[PDB]
Scaffold this active site. Structure first.
Site, short mmCIF file in Angstrom:
data_model
loop_
_atom_site.label_atom_id
_atom_site.label_comp_id
_atom_site.label_asym_id
_atom_site.label_seq_id
_atom_site.Cartn_x
_atom_site.Cartn_y
_atom_site.Cartn_z
N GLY A 192 0.79 -1.22 0.00
CA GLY A 192 0.00 0.00 0.00
C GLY A 192 0.82 1.27 0.00
CB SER A 193 3.88 2.33 1.61
OG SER A 193 3.11 2.50 2.79
CE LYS A 218 -2.29 2.34 9.25
NZ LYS A 218 -3.57 1.72 8.77
CB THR A 219 4.23 0.15 10.84
OG1 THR A 219 5.02 -0.38 9.76
CG2 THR A 219 2.85 -0.45 10.78
CG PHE A 220 9.09 4.82 9.66
CD1 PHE A 220 8.71 5.46 8.50
CD2 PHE A 220 10.42 4.89 10.07
CE1 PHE A 220 9.63 6.17 7.75
CE2 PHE A 220 11.35 5.59 9.31
CZ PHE A 220 10.95 6.24 8.15
CB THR A 263 7.47 -2.49 6.51
OG1 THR A 263 6.15 -2.11 6.92
CG2 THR A 263 7.39 -3.64 5.51
CD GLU A 284 9.26 -6.92 2.79
OE1 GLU A 284 8.81 -6.36 3.81
OE2 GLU A 284 8.66 -7.82 2.17
N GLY A 291 -3.51 0.81 4.01
CA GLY A 291 -2.46 0.98 3.01
C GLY A 291 -2.99 0.97 1.59
NE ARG A 292 -7.57 -3.58 1.65
CZ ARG A 292 -7.24 -4.06 2.85
NH1 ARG A 292 -5.98 -4.19 3.21
NH2 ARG A 292 -8.22 -4.42 3.69
CD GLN A 327 -1.88 -3.33 -2.19
OE1 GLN A 327 -1.11 -2.85 -3.02
NE2 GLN A 327 -1.64 -3.28 -0.88
CD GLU A 373 -3.73 -5.65 1.41
OE1 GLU A 373 -3.58 -4.89 0.42
OE2 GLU A 373 -3.18 -5.47 2.52
CG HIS A 413 -2.69 -8.43 -30.42
ND1 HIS A 413 -2.61 -8.59 -31.78
CD2 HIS A 413 -3.22 -7.20 -30.21
CE1 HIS A 413 -3.06 -7.50 -32.38
NE2 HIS A 413 -3.44 -6.64 -31.44
CE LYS A 454 3.88 -5.10 7.15
NZ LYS A 454 2.96 -3.93 7.16
O1 LIG Z 1 -0.07 -14.58 -30.43
C1 LIG Z 1 -0.39 -13.98 -31.49
O2 LIG Z 1 -0.60 -14.64 -32.56
C2 LIG Z 1 -0.51 -12.46 -31.50
O3 LIG Z 1 -0.16 -11.94 -30.23
C3 LIG Z 1 0.45 -11.92 -32.55
O4 LIG Z 1 1.76 -12.12 -32.08
C4 LIG Z 1 0.13 -10.44 -32.77
O5 LIG Z 1 -1.17 -10.34 -33.31
C5 LIG Z 1 1.13 -9.83 -33.74
O6 LIG Z 1 1.00 -10.53 -34.95
P1 LIG Z 1 2.19 -10.33 -36.05
O7 LIG Z 1 3.47 -10.88 -35.48
O8 LIG Z 1 1.76 -11.04 -37.31
O9 LIG Z 1 2.31 -8.83 -36.30
O1 LIG Z 2 -1.85 -3.42 2.45
C1 LIG Z 2 -1.04 -3.40 3.41
O2 LIG Z 2 -1.44 -3.22 4.60
C2 LIG Z 2 0.44 -3.62 3.12
O3 LIG Z 2 0.60 -3.69 1.73
C3 LIG Z 2 1.26 -2.46 3.65
O4 LIG Z 2 0.97 -1.30 2.89
C4 LIG Z 2 2.73 -2.86 3.54
O5 LIG Z 2 2.97 -3.99 4.33
C5 LIG Z 2 3.63 -1.74 4.05
O6 LIG Z 2 3.23 -1.47 5.36
P1 LIG Z 2 3.80 -0.06 5.99
O7 LIG Z 2 3.16 1.05 5.20
O8 LIG Z 2 3.43 -0.06 7.45
O9 LIG Z 2 5.31 -0.04 5.82
#
Ligand SMILES: O=C(O)[C@@H](O)[C@H](O)[C@H](O)COP(=O)(O)O
Ligand SMILES: O=C(O)[C@@H](O)[C@H](O)[C@H](O)COP(=O)(O)O
Ligand SMILES: Cn1ncc(Br)c1N
Ligand SMILES: Cn1ncc(Br)c1N
Lengths: 550, 550
Positions: free
Chosen positions: A163-164, A215-217, A219, A221, A276-277, A358, A362, A393, A515
């Site tokens: 969410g951040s 949010k928490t400071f 996390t 990562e 967060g979301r 998300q 979530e 395609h 987490k």
């Molecule tokens: O999977 C497929 O057939 C499509 O995604 C083609 O790759 C897309 O239409 C592009 O076609 P072309 O490579 O003839 O330009």
């Molecule tokens: O949706 C959530 O709650 C998580 O995706 C948080 O946003 C994510 O874990 C980061 O948390 P924070 O903002 O406390 O660092």
């Protein structure tokens, strides 16, 4: 506390099961239009934004008619969607499992309505953070905020996850037409060291500003990534006194912000009632305000606010996010479609499906109701998507000819920010938007395949069933205001679903558990000894990793 | 012809239905490990690549045991997976509806085995194109191929869509660590004019090379985009004779390449038996060879070749892509799980799920068998995913606590290309990989939630069911050869699925339809006169667009 236990207890639920058996399962959208010449008028709604711009919501290619929608509306009445919504806007602690208000609607309260949490108006406190965001982002953009060697800032790096992170990514991408040359935004989120290395590889510490978004400071990562950025900065800048010109924080936890070494003057706060979301409307959106300007960010908030007012004041039967939520319940619980597809016919919106993924999953990926009993019915769907025309395609092969029902939302702006070649590309893009939803509805039967030249065994391979449903959302232009309204629409669609299923759309105990899961194994990866403390697969994976790692 | 009509006609199909009811539906992975002290050894396989590197495929956290897997293998024998596979490798026209060979495996035939189509070996013809690709990409990278003002190339823009886009995008992102500074790749694909405008914004016509990537060289988006890029080029270069230093073609259609104004000497050719979603191994991969060097591209081909030989020569019960496909059938057709999740614990592979989404859904989103009758069972699954650890903070909430079974593949490299801070980030990344699959398997029951401090109605909200299945794939390092083996693994997994369902995994009549749908409406968009030639929704959307368009 809840007024009912399970969605299946609502009297209209079993009536909808009967309606599904009698007319829903084999619903012919073709016959529906033939029966009802006013079908398009009856199942499309025009939303008028605060700036008098407009968005057309056309639900008329869906597997729905007046009988079905009337029943779904009755279901929403029985489920107390209106009661729970009004409690949300009243600041009640409807996030029951964390005992929190749910008040992202207060973040975009630009009208300064009284919006109290715990009996105390939030209007001015929210507005004061926005005033700080305007002042700071203005000073970044006009060059008056300079780095430790006196140069203007050229690059802003948001560091945060979940969410951040995803709101800032999606919205800066979606509104990239409103940015200025020479002021760029970047995003480090993954703990994978690749994300840090590749993002910082060509940036200059003297002209780079970091926003640590958490949010928490606490996390893992984010704090680890923020530490790596601080180390990268100090490798060139040397003295920690210079961090105050290059690091700000977007958070609820001032104590942890200061302990990390960021000055409180450089903190942009929000409160626990911002999920967060649901957080891009808060201080978490500071990277947006810097990239496109605070006034564009404010217009984004005002678009959400106008959709909030529509959601709050409109009778259910004409309430656009409610209608969208009811159709999802119809497909998820009565047709048994496990997925929902969102396809922007818009390259700027290429991260919109990921952001909705998300928000939706979530929020509504839950198995326990507000009555604290387990569900015996499907809750949240699996959301996916990619931009068109690319998607036409690729996996559109399966949308057209596979064996799964995949309700789909198609989104197009009538006007491009990039109308090159006197709109030649734009007319082609629009023609695809119209023709794809047309084809999914009308299909192509055996007789037409034969008339088109196929014979023998080839004929069935080239048939299309039709009656594959779409919702088409046509905006005039994807402005900040339009994007604000569009996200809020999906926020309130998600709200409606969750209210019907009687779940708490606003906690996330699976993300919270995640987490805290990794620490024990992280410690085991510090020494090279073999491990036997887990199940045999976890042990085998860890031990193979130990043999193969550096 | 086909040897059976429907997958439900295979005798083992009904036996697997009985096994699902008695052992499958309520399968306990915890019980399986307790019952089988060798389960990890029994349900994991080490693949050895041509370069002696290794990939561990650990299926042991799936809802499978010896009895179930042996029945799935028997189903594969009854379905003639091996006969269809051998027919593919023999050059037979197993793409029945288009009467084509299916010979992506011949593209990576670096051993120059005899691999004939229509009775004529393809080995030297394929090798000759790779020789051209090596020559040309070498000249771009060493600066000897100069632009029209005598400058070396700094920027390569691929123009194409679908199969002519997503492989080049995904693989250049995945192998970005092997690029060099000052030589960048870019991709125009969407017809949306934004994609052209934003990609060409900062580029110099003097030092930019375009690759027009189109099997047919008639696709509307790609030719329109290619014309726009030529107009952009000529706005600066003025003279069309300069086109020969800045435009190359990757195609099967020489006449249309030359008619577009590209020199035949600048054409990198391939054949009708290369499907788009299987085409990154062909001339379509030229952007990869330019970005990371031909020898890395060749190692990528050799990794695919080694996995091909595994798939070709290994009895079914130890055949790694077959095992992956049989599990997909098990979840899709007996548990009723409509989706499949792919999560790389790897930022470089952030576009890997989107690439597999095309490979999987476009191949197996079919409703008609090789006996030219409609199926009475589910075919291709809906694939989705994002890289971890980001995914753990968002839709993993639903994966852990929602109401839907979501079979998932987790992928991690034991060694990072960016082992910053003495591998601190990499060890954290890895710990999340092990911990997430462990938690999905073991869960957390009522008693443990109570022991951890929750009381009353909060308890069920914090429980996790466990027995949510994952496959863990652990590579030593994502080298070109590793990525080549990984993509080929999923190609042959997709093969195995489609062979059991008895569908043609290699046509795409919904994709072919999409490329002829828009022209009729396009001509109606030349006017702002209202239209009434369609159904009322299509009419209403077109007419509202006309009222709002620029
Ligand atoms: O999977 C497929 O057939 C499509 O995604 C083609 O790759 C897309 O239409 C592009 O076609 P072309 O490579 O003839 O330009
Ligand atoms: O949706 C959530 O709650 C998580 O995706 C948080 O946003 C994510 O874990 C980061 O948390 P924070 O903002 O406390 O660092
Ligand atoms: C069902 N659905 N579609 C988009 C969003 Br967000 C949700 N919850
Ligand atoms: C079922 N599945 N998983 C990955 C891919 Br490719 C497919 N077809």
């Amino acid at each position: 506390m809840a007024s009912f236990k399970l969605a299946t207890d609502l009297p209209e639920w079993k009536k909808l099961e009967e309606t599904y058996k009698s007319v829903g399962e084999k619903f012919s959208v073709r016959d529906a239009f033939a029966k009802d010449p006013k079908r398009f008028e009856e199942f499309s709604w025009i939303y008028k934004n605060y700036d008098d711009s407009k968005i057309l919501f056309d639900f008329s290619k869906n597997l729905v008619n007046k009988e079905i929608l009337d029943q779904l509306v009755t279901l929403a009445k029985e489920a107390g969607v209106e009661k729970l919504r009004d409690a949300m806007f009243a600041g009640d602690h409807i996030n029951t499992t964390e005992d929190r208000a749910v008040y992202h609607v207060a973040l975009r309260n630009r009208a300064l309505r009284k919006m109290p949490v715990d009996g105390k108006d939030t209007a001015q406190e929210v507005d004061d953070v926005l005033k700080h965001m305007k002042e700071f982002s203005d000073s970044i953009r006009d060059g008056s905020w300079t780095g430790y060697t006196g140069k203007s800032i050229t690059d802003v790096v948001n560091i945060g996850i979940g969410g951040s992170d995803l709101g800032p990514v999606m919205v800066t991408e979606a509104l990239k037409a409103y940015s200025k040359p020479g002021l760029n935004v970047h995003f480090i989120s993954n703990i994978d060291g690749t994300h840090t290395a590749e993002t910082l590889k060509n940036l200059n510490p003297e002209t780079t500003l970091f926003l640590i978004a958490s949010k928490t400071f606490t996390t893992a990562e984010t704090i680890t990534n923020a530490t790596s950025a601080k180390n990268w900065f100090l490798a060139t800048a040397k003295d920690s006194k210079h961090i105050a010109k290059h690091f700000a924080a977007l958070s609820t936890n001032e104590k942890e912000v200061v302990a990390f070494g960021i000055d409180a003057k450089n903190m942009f706060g929000f409160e626990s009632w911002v999920g967060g979301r649901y957080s891009v409307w808060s201080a978490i959106g500071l990277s947006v305000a810097i990239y496109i300007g605070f006034e564009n960010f404010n217009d984004f908030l005002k678009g959400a606010e106008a959709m909030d007012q529509h959601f709050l004041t409109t009778p259910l039967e004409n309430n656009i996010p409610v209608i969208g939520g009811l159709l999802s319940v119809w497909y998820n619980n009565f047709f048994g479609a496990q997925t929902h597809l969102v396809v922007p016919f818009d390259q700027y919106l290429h991260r919109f499906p990921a952001y909705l993924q998300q928000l939706s999953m979530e929020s509504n990926g839950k198995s326990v109701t507000r009555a604290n009993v387990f569900t015996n019915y499907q809750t949240g769907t699996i959301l996916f998507g990619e931009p068109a025309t690319n998607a036409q395609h690729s996996f559109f092969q399966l949308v057209h000819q596979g064996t799964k029902l995949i309700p789909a939302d198609f989104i197009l702006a009538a006007q491009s920010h990039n109308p090159i070649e006197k709109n030649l590309h734009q007319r082609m893009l629009a023609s695809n938007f119209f023709a794809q939803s047309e084809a999914l509805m009308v299909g192509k039967d055996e007789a037409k395949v034969k008339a088109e030249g196929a014979t023998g065994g080839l004929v069935p391979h080239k048939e299309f069933s039709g009656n594959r449903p779409t919702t088409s959302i046509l905006a005039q232009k994807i402005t900040p205001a339009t994007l604000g309204s569009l996200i809020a629409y999906y926020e309130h669609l998600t709200f409606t679903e969750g209210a019907i299923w009687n779940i708490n759309s606003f906690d996330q105990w699976g993300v919270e558990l995640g987490k805290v899961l990794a620490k024990v194994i992280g410690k085991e990866l510090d020494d090279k000894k073999a491990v036997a403390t887990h199940d045999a697969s976890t042990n085998g994976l860890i031990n193979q990793f130990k043999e193969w790692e550096e």
